[PDB]
Amino acid sequence: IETRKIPIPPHRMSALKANPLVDHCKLQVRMNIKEKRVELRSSKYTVSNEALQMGADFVSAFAMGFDIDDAIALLRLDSLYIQSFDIKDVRQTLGPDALSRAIGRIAGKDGKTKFAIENATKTRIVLAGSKVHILGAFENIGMARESIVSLVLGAQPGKVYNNLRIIASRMKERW
RNA sequence: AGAGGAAGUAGGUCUCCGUAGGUGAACCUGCGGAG
DSSP states (O other): EEEEEEEOOSSSHHHHHHHHHHHHHHHEEEEEETTTTTEEEESOOOHHHHHHHHHHHHHHHHHHHHHHHHHHHHHHHHTTTTEEETEEEEEEEOOOOOOHHHHHHOOOGGHHHHHHHHHHTTEEEEETTTEEEEEEEEEHHHHHHHHHHHHHTTTTTTHHHHHHHHHHHHHOOOO
């Protein structure tokens, strides 16, 4: 019998207040968004550390910013991953124009480039300041990561998007 | 004015907060801070 307790941010608190994981994984849960913790606990009906770990990754990813749709998608697909990238990782210039300009290049007006790479490379992204979070198969995740570091490197969205699309095609192809 | 003669050129998204107004709990818009 194992339990695991996860802390949350105060951002998504009403989304958590909206309403099942006991029915999902037969795994008993307590919650308190004032101590910012949630308690996953293995009962006699939960059978696997994989069920424990995937419920943990599920709740922590919904905390880290995605919604219930891609959350239960993470719950369903076992081959489906999340990753947390900081923009303070590998840095081309030492000037502190890093946050605003690079995330302007990346997200763009009305999230057009963001949603564009989401639809073009089959992944799902959330942007939270210095921390961005990729969700997908690990190929899509690493691909989105290279697109992110190139759009902070300084290539225009046109060229990085075109290369992104063509490698999306050659990645999707079986033969 | 004259018909002739002759020649030549054709780029800040999502969420949270603090605001001001709006139709008020909420909620929307505008502004300013955080992930």
